[PDB]
Each structure stands twice: as structure tokens, then as C-alpha cells.
Amino acid sequence: GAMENFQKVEKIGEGTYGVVYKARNKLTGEVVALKKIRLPSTAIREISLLKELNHPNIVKLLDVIHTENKLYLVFEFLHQDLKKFMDASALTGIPLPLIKSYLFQLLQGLAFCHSHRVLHRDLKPQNLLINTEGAIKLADFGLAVVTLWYRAPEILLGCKYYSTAVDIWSLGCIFAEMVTRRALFPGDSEIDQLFRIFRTLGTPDEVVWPGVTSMPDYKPSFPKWARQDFSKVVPPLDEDGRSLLSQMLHYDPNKRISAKAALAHPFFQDVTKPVPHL
Numbered sequence: 001g002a003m004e005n006f007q008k009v010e011k012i013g014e015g016t017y018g019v020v021y022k023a024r025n026k027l028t029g030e031v032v033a034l035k036k037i038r039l040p041s042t043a044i045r046e047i048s049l050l051k052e053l054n055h056p057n058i059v060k061l062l063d064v065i066h067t068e069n070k071l072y073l074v075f076e077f078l079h080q081d082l083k084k085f086m087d088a089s090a091l092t093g094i095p096l097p098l099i100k101s102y103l104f105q106l107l108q109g110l111a112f113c114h115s116h117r118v119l120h121r122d123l124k125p126q127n128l129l130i131n132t133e134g135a136i137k138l139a140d141f142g143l144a145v146v147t148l149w150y151r152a153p154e155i156l157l158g159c160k161y162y163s164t165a166v167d168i169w170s171l172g173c174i175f176a177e178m179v180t181r182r183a184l185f186p187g188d189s190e191i192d193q194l195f196r197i198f199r200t201l202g203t204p205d206e207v208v209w210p211g212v213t214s215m216p217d218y219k220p221s222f223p224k225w226a227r228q229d230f231s232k233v234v235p236p237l238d239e240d241g242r243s244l245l246s247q248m249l250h251y252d253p254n255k256r257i258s259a260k261a262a263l264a265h266p267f268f269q270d271v272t273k274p275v276p277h278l
């Protein structure tokens with residue numbers, strides 16, 4: 001069939017959706033990442049739309065193959081991801097110029113996506129792919145144990161209708177993690193995740209987040225924790241970085257900085273594109 005054209009090299013992982021292989025296209029010679037999804041006409045169209053969402057900081061969707069109760073997604077292959085790179089840089093830390101470069105590129109990717117009203121919905125270090133050229137790319141565009149660490153509070157509080165702000169939240173959480181070498185909000189249940197957020201950022205109220213007390217899963221019985229200083233949260237990040245990060249972690253989605261506006265932030269005045277040691 002269609003899949004005879006792909007020579008499996010190795011299983012590279014497995015997710016909620018399905019299994020990912022490193023594979024070789026026998027006709028093009030291309031090395032690819034191949035996702036097998038076990039099985040809808042709406043997914044076929046919504047995924048096919050991702051084939052046109054092409055940007056240098058988005059992993060390239062080469063092919064959508066719907067054959068025989070199975071959907072295969074053929075993607076560009078990259079050798080490393082940010083979770084593994086973070087782990088390999090634990091003793092030393094990712095140098096700030098590279099953190100900055102990565103954050104900048106990811107915001108370009110988001111800006112592009114968000115300009116087309118496409119949300120990612122599920123940014124996490126594992127799905128941010130890096131190469132030897134200094135590039136970082138968004139992968140695994142979510143459609144609409146699964147990690148909760150990068151989930152925006154409006155999602156946790158039961159907002160049915162996400163805005164692009166959910167991605168900015170997630171990227172802020174990733175930025176802080178690259179800086180501190182520890183996850184910002186490592187929740188192990190939805191309530192633990194929400195309360196970890198509250199313990200750092202203050203339990204939100206109508207002052208800081210108009211509408212919060214009407215949200216579907218908002219409970220008046222939530223404990224009232226006070227906000228901590230950001231200088232406590234992400235030392236030794238500089239004032240530009242902390243200012244940007246605070247704007248990316250605003251509780252209210254409508255106050256949260258956009259990707260486009262983040263790209264103009266003074267934090268990026270001295271941005272460069274270093275090459276990492278992989």
C-alpha cells in the first residue's frame with residue numbers, strides 16, 4: 001500500500017494520539033517522522049489545513065495519508081527536542097543568548113499561527129524541536145498521562161473557547177523553565193496545577209481577572225494565596241526578561257501579551273541566533 005513506500009528506521013516515541021517512527025521515504029530518500037493514528041471526515045479536513053500552515057519555526061507537514069482505517073502523518077524529522085536538550089543542560093544551564101533566540105523564534109512561529117487564527121493548544125518542551133543550525137520549531141499542533149504543566153488557567157477553570165493567549169501562557173512557562181532549570185508549575189492533577197499557579201501568582205479575583213469568578217470550574221472556596229515577587233520566581237533573569245515573562249503570565253487572557261507584541265519587547269533588542277552544542 002501507501003506505507004510500503006516508507007522504510008521504518010526506529011520507533012522514536014508514542015503519545016495519546018499514536019506511535020511515531022523515524023522512517024525513510026523509499027522514493028524521495030527523505031528521512032521523516034511518521035505518525036500512525038488509529039481510527040472522521042472533520043479531522044481529515046482540519047489536519048489537511050495544517051499542510052498549508054508553513055513557517056520556518058513550524059515542523060513541516062509533508063504528507064497526510066488516509067488509508068485503511070488509519071491516518072498517517074509524515075513530518076519533517078529533527079534530531080533533538082527541547083525537553084531532552086534541557087535535561088542534557090541541567091548541570092550547566094542553557095546559555096541566555098540561546099534561551100532568548102529560542103523564545104524569539106517560538107514567538108515568530110506563534111505570531112504566524114495566530115495571524116491565521118490557528119492555536120497550538122499544547123506547547124511543551126517535548127514538542128519543540130531543535131536542529132544544529134540554531135533553529136527551534138513548533139510541533140504537534142493540538143486540535144479541538146497528558147502533562148498539565150503548561151496549561152493556561154482559563155483552560156483549567158473550564159473555558160470551552162480558547163484564545164491564542166493559551167499558547168503565550170504555555171511559552172511563558174517554558175521560558176521560565178529554560179531560565180531556572182526547573183518547571184515553573186509542575187502540577188500532577190488539575191487542582192494541583194491550578195493551586196500551584198495560585199500559590200505563585202496569587203489566587204485570581206475580579207480585580208486582576210474580570211469574569212474569573214463566573215468561570216465553569218471556579219469555586220469561591222479556593223484558598224486565597226498572595227502573589228509572590230517575580231524576582232523570587234525566575235532569578236537571575238534580568239528586568240526585561242521578567243517584565244516580558246510577567247506579561248506572558250497575566251491571568252486575564254485579554255491582558256496577556258500577544259506574540260506579535262512580545263516580538264517588539266526590549267528583551268529582544270540584543271537577540272542573536274547562536275548555534276547550540278547538541
Ligand SMILES: CS(=O)(=O)c1cccc2c(-c3nc(N[C@H]4CCCNC4)ncc3C(F)(F)F)c[nH]c12
Nearest residue numbers: 012013014015020033075076077078079080081139
Ligand atoms: C509527543 S509524541 O508521542 O507525539 C512524539 C513522540 C516521538 C516523536 C515525536 C515528534 C517528532 N520528533 C522528531 N524527532 C524526535 C527525535 C528523538 C528526540 N525527540 C524528537 N522529529 C519530528 C517529530 C514530528 F513533530 F515531526 F512528528 C513529535 N511528536 C512526537
